[PDB]
Amino acid sequence: NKLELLPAVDVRDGQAVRLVHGVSGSETSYGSPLEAALAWQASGAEWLHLVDLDAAFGTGDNRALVAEITGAMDIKVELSGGIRDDASLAAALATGCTRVNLGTAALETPEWAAKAIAEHGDRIAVGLDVRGTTLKGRGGDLYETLARLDSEGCARYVVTDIGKDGTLTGPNLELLKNVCAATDRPVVASGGISSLEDLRALAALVPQGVEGAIVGKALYAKAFTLEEALKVVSA
Template sequence: MGLRSFIIPAVDIKDGKAVRLYKGDPNAVTVYGENPVDMAKIWEEKGAKHLHIVDLDGAFEGKPKNYRLVERIVKKISIPVEFGGGLRSFDAVKTIIEIGVEKVVIGSLAYQNRREFEKIVETFPNKVILGIDAKDGKVAIKGWLEKTEYTPLEFAKQFDDMDIWGFLYTDVNRDGAMIGPNIEGTKYLAENLKHPVIASGGVGSIEDLKKLYSLKDFGVYGVVVGKALYEGKIKLEELEE
């Protein structure tokens, strides 16, 4: 797998548009496209092997708000889609999987209602990515607004024996800031867990990308990249497949 396959471009949706937040702040928004469907198509055409979609409205409101848009994206592209944002019930997950999403990213629900989370994993084995959003060394939930008492590894360990696909580790303080990913935190998590880890947050250059890529053997599967792609710091089409 080359660098291009390692990248999972992010399409974050807010108010029907493709945006990026700065450090998870809903008020620090940059709009990168009026139409998220077109944006998804662009990343596929540039050679993306999979796509990461986040419903930011859903993350902050507690239930997905952009089903129709996500459905249009899934129908328009042929690469697999992972989706997160407001998936806090079995029914919400069932609906999103039924419209063709390959994998779902769930964070808050695993913390708030373990029984419901277990039901989802049992019903949809190998389709759940547990989202671990870290803020100041602790796991944050509810759209990064509330911090828990768990460190990322403490939280992840509780679910590592389940039939999940793996983990998505986001350092919220770096997200959208392009100040470099949390290499040590990502490596520590990956080498102490059985399931693969997807990194997220902070990638701003090819050098950042290569540092994460070097952690492949520790269990780091890929990295979600947003702002660096949108602003041309990393050009997907120029990377080796």
């Protein structure tokens, strides 16, 4: 398969935004998140990666708007942000998204996350936010957690290097290679993508287990177009 591209739309206070290092308050705003999602779809996106950052940070939420965006997509939607308990998981699933991501929940409430995995299967992926080998949440050892989540039947991982997120300095390819070497489950790369060369490098890791790549600031800051990105990961 080709590398899947998941252009991102992160929502804060009803706006499309990008963060640096995932830090609340580092937002750059780009306007309407609905218009952004529809633009990605129009350019040929197969996936939207949609994030409710208010829910992630515990500052209210954008539930109605996230539901509207998801419903406006004819393409697959991965939804993330603050999915930490039965009600936030139910709200997310009710958007009709293709899959959700659990992040902090895997660290803070591992038994709840295991139960969600058992009950929803591959509608769940787990986000791993990494610095070095340490997991972070809004702690844990990367390989111990990966091993535990594997044994619990986790279908898929979304791996973010926090130090690269929103920085346009390139992805952490070594991190990604070694997570792929540790689990047989598909890995989605997130954070740092800055150039078409970065995408070529990620595409070369598909045989090792990199299934897809979430692309954020490179698209909003026009490092390349989504059309270029889709061409480059094609054969």
